[PDB]
Write a protein that binds this DNA or RNA. Structure first.
Lengths: 44, 275, 87
RNA sequence: UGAUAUUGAAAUGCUUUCUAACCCGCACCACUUAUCGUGGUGGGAGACAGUGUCAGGCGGGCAGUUUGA
RNA sequence: UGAGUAGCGAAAGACGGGUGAGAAUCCCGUCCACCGAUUGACUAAGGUUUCCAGAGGAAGGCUCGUCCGCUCUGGGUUAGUCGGGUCCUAAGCUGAGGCCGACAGGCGUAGGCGAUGGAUAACAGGUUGAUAUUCCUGUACCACCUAUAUCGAUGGGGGGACGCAGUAGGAUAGGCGAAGCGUGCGAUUGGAUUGCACGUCUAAGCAGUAAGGAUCCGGUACGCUGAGCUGUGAUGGGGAGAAGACAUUGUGUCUUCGAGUCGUUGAUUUCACACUGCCGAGAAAAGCCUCUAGGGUGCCCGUACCGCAAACCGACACAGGUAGUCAAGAUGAGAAUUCUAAGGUGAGCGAGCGAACUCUCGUUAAGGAACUCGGCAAAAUGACCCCGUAACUUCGGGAGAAGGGGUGCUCUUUAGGGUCCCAGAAGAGCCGCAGUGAAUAGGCCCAAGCGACUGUUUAUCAAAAACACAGGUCUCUGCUAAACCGUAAGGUGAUGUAUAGGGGCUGACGCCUGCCCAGU
RNA sequence: CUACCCUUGGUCAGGUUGAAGUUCAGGUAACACUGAAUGGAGGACCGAACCGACUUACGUUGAAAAGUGAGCGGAUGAACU
């Protein structure tokens, strides 16, 4: 049975990485919203 | 010519193909081929904007010249070749200076022709003259619509359109559709009909043979759900059930004209069509 | 320069090859050219060659609070004349 | 689909003509061994189209709701 | 509480000797058993220290544990040539100027990023508990640097450079049976012309080789490149069935010494998109060549380990899923079937007893579908070689129709074929209940309904008489086409042009398609 | 994960049938008809890998949030990855 999560490094960093979030305008807001919370992992 | 396939199986049972007897080289000429990538009916937004397209066999665009703009240098036809992109064949022609080009092949050609501006070496198939030099009653093809732009009308296989009288600045052309319209008189045109007249008679045989030309299946709106297509739901096989047959996007699809093709050219079109 | 940090005195993979090869922990942003010239400038030898490999930070050192060690870079040098590059 | 602005010039409000406006997913040249673009020239069309404000009509293609005891 | 109840996750273990506080469960050993187109060997993702040695037994391990993928303490990843960067570019993303837009921003040119593809110099053997074209030994190759006519582009041209299917061939790897060496010559009746087991060896550098082909440049007209394979050496080198010598079972092991390698028979799925055929007409850019305008140096990342799995995705040490390379013997069409080789494995609860009942498996008197919604399920047919074979038909088919016969071993004679190997005729005879003696591999026929056919679908109650379909017909569309996304720019349609594109219905083929335009 | 699409790679023991065409013959003014070889087509036939999910038994605090056993369909293509 093929499950929903197949791990992959390139896709993970190319969709959810810092550069991808710091690229668009609602990704800078995600970082600005995760920094305020105090999260120790902003993007990965 | 037409090959009729023998019924060795269902699927090939009532099939038919072209003979390919006029095709000489059977190999594309390098340095005139530009790569073409398939778009599968998809917009720049990446969304399926035209239906039933997609898949097929990989091809390669042949840089053909519909302008036919040379100052009167000769050209001896080399070979007639297959072209996956159009219905008509093509012809590779070498000019007497050294330049090779691809022309759309008019029917009955191996001869050698001239890209003229008048009837000096007289009118005959392959010769491409401006319209004012072309006598009334010829059958020409590959007609420009605006000067120096390139041929746009009558480019398909077994296509043609004859020149009726003139009007001092325009000419009257009766297109293959059955329309009479006025064309500017400095617009080029080649002589003759376009070969490959048997392309219409082919029975493509099976459902996977139309599938590798690039086509995809067409569901019928009557077998859809009521939010997908205006025909849509019901119980059992149901009729149209409306005042008129609709398209998938809620417009009448049988009878209603949609001619916003232009307005500035309404004054140039003399007739309707007989299609 | 001091691009060399430490000698690496281990059991076999540093003493079974100390007939000619001498192993160091070096800085983590250096070449084998930098290390090949640094050894020759410090100890006054003729270094025949040098091999380098990186080690990832292990999470082995865990007390009440779990943590990682340092990433470290280890360089083996093969001499052509001289000796005594870790005592 | 009509009025009005962009919007002019003439001759027998409606007609016909001209050209500088406005337009050309037309050709050639220069930015530039890109032509997306800008400009400049020739041609095509021309006070029409396109666009703005106002008004009438069609409009289950889409929306919000109603459908008594 | 249910209750010491259900379960303890597919399967073969038995004994001997250790260690230890404690042994079915840990270590060593002999016998037995399982997989062997895979449970064996190698690698891409993905995990990310789980790999090794010395210690440990609180928790984890569906029991035990003296043990471990668990706890503690120390270690382990080595590159000029391997895979990526310092080379190229698909699709796509991004985009200086630029176009469009209440803002945010959307689109887009030059340019750029980017592999799953193209280019690109290294091979054998040895070694450790843990690396191995990386370290070491031997033998090589490439780029640049210093000593003792050439360079030609950011430009032109050639090449690079390609689909699918079919056989015919050359050679090789691997496979096997004799001879040649090296050890054995006996259990229980027998024999000694007997039983085993090994046969080579790389790159690079030289030879020769089936086959196969009017900018000095390109285009117009009027003996050449490359090419599997073999071979001399490289190689007095390396290795090896094993053989003789040394100390504590020297268990064993360091150590030097010295041995064969020959001819033959079938034959790739590896070695040519080569040649022939076909329609569906089968990437781009650089490296490269070309023409003109003009004695040393050699960097960064990965490398351990698991990788059909107890280490990845499934919450679990979970019968599921997971791309690619290799591919032995007997039998054979064969990567099928049964038994085995190389190599691995005995599955993390057992010992009894042999009740009812449930599950999986074998047999059954006489009859035979009587059961029941319904011959569901099971049984029956099944391999090869011969005869033989109906209505119907779109002339292809139906058809493996249906229905019958043969099949082991031994010995005789006896035209074949390849170059020891493969294929046959006939006759005589032996045996049993039985001869494709096991495993495996169609039940068939007579009529009707639907759909012409192959195909597809409700990921996890439906796979069909439904969808698709080739073919028919109507209709909009003259090119900035119509239609569609955005409803701006910009796009698909289409780098197409009415024998072309969008929409509606019907649905191979054969015979046909009536009447009515009130009304919408 | 799933549905289509784009680009660029990969896989499909074996064995059997025998379309077009060609070529020899023969037959004609001729075309062009009958026979024998050669050829090797096809959403072709049988059947492992591979991809499915038709019938049934088991299970149902499942080994597992869709599986297992036994059979079953396709298996050069409108394939599968």
């Amino acid at each position: 049975v093929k499950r929903t999560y197949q791990p992959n490094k390139r896709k993970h960093s190319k969709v959810h990485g810092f550069r991808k979030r710091m690229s668009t305008k609602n990704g800078r807001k995600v970082l600005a919203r995760r920094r305020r919370k105090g999260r120790k992992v902003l993007s990965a | 010519a037409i090959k009729k396939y023998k019924p060795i199986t269902n699927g090939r049972r009532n099939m038919t193909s072209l003979d390919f007897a006029e095709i000489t080289k059977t190999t594309p000429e390098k340095s005139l081929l530009k790569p073409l990538p398939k778009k599968a009916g998809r917009n720049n937004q990446g969304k399926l904007t035209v239906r039933h397209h997609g898949g097929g066999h990989k091809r390669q665009y042949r840089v053909i010249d519909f302008k036919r703009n040379k100052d009167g240098i000769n050209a001896k036809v080399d070979s007639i070749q297959y072209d996956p992109n159009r219905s008509a064949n093509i012809a590779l022609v070498v000019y007497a200076d050294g330049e090779k080009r691809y022309i759309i092949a008019p029917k009955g050609l191996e001869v050698g022709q001239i890209v003229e501006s008048g009837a000096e070496a007289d009118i005959k198939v392959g010769n491409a003259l401006p319209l004012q030099n072309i006598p009334v009653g010829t059958v020409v093809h590959n007609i420009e619509l605006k000067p120096g732009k390139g041929g746009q009308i009558a480019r398909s296989a077994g296509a043609s359109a004859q020149v009726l009288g003139k009007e001092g600045k325009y000419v009257l052309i009766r297109l293959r559709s059955g329309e009479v319209r006025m064309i500017l008189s400095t617009c080029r045109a080649t002589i003759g009909q376009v070969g490959n007249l048997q392309h219409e008679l082919v029975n493509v045989g099976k459902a996977g043979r139309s599938r590798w030309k690039g086509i995809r299946p067409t569901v019928r709106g009557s077998v859809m759900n009521p939010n997908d297509h205006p025909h849509g739901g019901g119980e059992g096989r149901a009729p149209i059930g409306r005042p008129s047959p609709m398209s998938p996007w809620g417009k009448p699809t049988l009878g209603k004209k949609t001619r916003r093709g232009k307005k500035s050219s309404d004054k140039l079109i003399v007739r309707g069509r007989k299609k | 320069r001091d691009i060399l940090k430490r000698p690496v005195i281990t059991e076999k993979s540093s003493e079974a090859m100390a007939e000619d090869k001498y192993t160091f922990d070096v800085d983590t942003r250096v070449n084998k050219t930098q290390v090949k010239m640094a050894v020759e400038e410090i100890f006054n030898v003729k270094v025949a060659s040098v091999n380098i490999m990186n080690y990832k930070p292990k999470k082995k050192r865990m007390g009440r609070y779990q943590g990682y060690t340092n990433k470290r870079r280890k360089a083996i040098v093969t001499l052509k004349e001289g000796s005594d590059d870790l005592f």
